[PDB]
Amino acid sequence: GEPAIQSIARFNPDNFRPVGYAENIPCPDTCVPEGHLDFRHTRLPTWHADRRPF
Amino acid sequence: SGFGTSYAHDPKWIEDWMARKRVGVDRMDWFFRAFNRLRLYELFFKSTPRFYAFMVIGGLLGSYYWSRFWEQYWIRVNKGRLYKDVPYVYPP
Ligand SMILES: CCCCCCCCCCCCCCCCCC(=O)OC[C@H](COP(=O)([O-])OCC(O)COP(=O)([O-])OC[C@@H](COC(=O)CCCCCCCCCCCCCCCCC)OC(=O)CCCCCCCCCCCCCCCCC)OC(=O)CCCCCCCCCCCCCCCCC
Ligand SMILES: CCCCCCCCCCCCCCCCCC(=O)OC[C@H](COP(=O)([O-])OCC(O)COP(=O)([O-])OC[C@@H](COC(=O)CCCCCCCCCCCCCCCCC)OC(=O)CCCCCCCCCCCCCCCCC)OC(=O)CCCCCCCCCCCCCCCCC
Question: End-to-end distance of chain B based on CA atoms, in angstroms?
């Protein structure tokens, strides 16, 4: 008894998501997970010597 | 463990290896500190024309003495087996 306009509106592809989409799909917060080396670990000490000459 | 399967994962000793980040440690700073005292950057590298001259004049001198060093190495290794080392005695 639903108006056909309302019935066909539900079957929009945006209304279908696989069961469990929200509990499985990864949601990365960074491309460098914790425990991986990055610039914050390789930066030289502030008392270092110029590296341009070499 | 799990090597060779879909369960493969980094062993503990690899995890410990990657836990050593050496943050704030510089054991080779002495080398750069002493190298900078040669003033190569101030004198040669900084200016492009002098940078070229270093490559050209360095290559000139370097090539000659590089050849000179290994020529002596060859003469030492083959001592007694070179034409110059064994003067020929003419048959009587
Ligand atoms: C023209 C003259 C002008 C005037 C005079 C100039 C005079 C100066 C000349 C200087 C010449 C260069 C000397 C080396 C300088 C230091 C190294 C360097 O480049 O530093 C930049 C940089 C420093 O590292 P960093 O991480 O920036 O350091 C940060 C902090 O400073 C410190 O950070 P950290 O403390 O946290 O440490 C991090 C890092 C620090 O990094 C390092 O220190 C590691 C890299 C060191 C490389 C050392 C290179 C030495 C050059 C070879 C000389 C050969 C002489 C042969 C003589 C033959 C004569 C005919 O260390 C590590 O990651 C740890 C693991 C290191 C493993 C290294 C394994 C090497 C084993 C060697 C065994 C040798 C056994 C020989 C037995 C022989 C028996 C007879 O290192 C590199 O990038 C170098 C490695 C790159 C890959 C090597 C490529 C190998 C393939 C080529 C093979 C053939 C070799 C031909 C040799 C040609 C020589 C001309
Ligand atoms: C707590 C830890 C402590 C650690 C300690 C570690 C120690 C570090 C170790 C490293 C060495 C340290 C040395 C300490 C010296 C202390 C004394 C001092 O005050 O030094 C003066 C001074 C230090 O600088 P500074 O006092 O701080 O002043 C900073 C200025 O910005 C720079 O001064 P400047 O530029 O105003 O005056 C320098 C001036 C000093 O000389 C003069 O002022 C003389 C001026 C002439 C006076 C009138 C003379 C008339 C008669 C001439 C008769 C002779 C003619 C023939 C000459 C032929 C020469 C070939 O000229 C030079 O030295 C040479 C540059 C000349 C002009 C360059 C531009 C022209 C165009 C170049 C084109 C580019 C390509 C060139 C070719 C490159 C190679 C292929 O200069 C130097 O020590 C630098 C030397 C530069 C020459 C090249 C060095 C590279 C070769 C190294 C080989 C290493 C071999 C390793 C063997 C290993 C065996 C196991």
Answer: 80
Q: After which residues is chain B broken (C to N over 2.5 A)?
A: none
Distance from C-alpha of A25 to C-alpha of B41, rounded to nearest angstrom: 53
Collapsed DSSP state (helix, strand, coil) of residue B3: coil
List the single best residue of B10, B23, B31, B44 to mutate versus A (max A Cβ within 10 A): B23
Experimental approach taken: cryo-EM
- Asked if the Cβ–Cβ distance from A54 to B45 is below 8 Å, we say no
d(CA A49, CA B26): 10
SS3 assignment, position B60: helix
Ligand 2 mean position, distance from CA B30 (Å): 20
Best mutation site among A42, A44, A46, A52 for ligand 1, i.e. most ligand atoms within 8 A of its Cβ?
A44
| Resolution of the PDB structure in angstroms | 2.2
